[PDB]
């Protein structure tokens, strides 16, 4: 019996593949200062920024906090701390994908 001939389906599929976008990434320093007054026990949002798809951030934080003057060297320990979170926009607005 004869042997079957190929179909063109694979070459037709290949012609339909769009090229990748050429992005023009760059590296730069985005340093910023922030100054404030606050009281203990509250969660204070001291840093806020917007990250794009394909960003990379490396963050160093310097802090100087001064306590307003105590009466005596009170005996209890007292930590200052800073915690950072990522929040995708689609978690905070249902229409974010439809907006895009």
């Amino acid at each position: 019996f004869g042997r079957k001939v190929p179909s063109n389906a694979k070459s037709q599929h290949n012609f339909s593949v769009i090229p990748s976008a050429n992005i023009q990434r760059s590296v730069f320093n985005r340093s910023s200062g922030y100054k404030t007054t606050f009281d203990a026990g509250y969660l204070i949002p001291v840093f806020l920024d917007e990250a794009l798809p394909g960003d990379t951030f490396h963050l160093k934080t310097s802090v100087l906090a001064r306590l307003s003057t105590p009466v005596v060297p009170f005996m209890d320990n007292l930590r200052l701390d800073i915690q950072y979170f990522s929040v995708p926009y689609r978690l905070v607005w249902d229409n974010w994908q439809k907006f895009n």
Partner: peptide
């Protein structure tokens, strides 16, 4: 298997 035109449909 790459990024097709008109978005993804398998």
């Amino acid at each position: 298997a790459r990024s097709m035109r008109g978005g993804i449909r398998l």
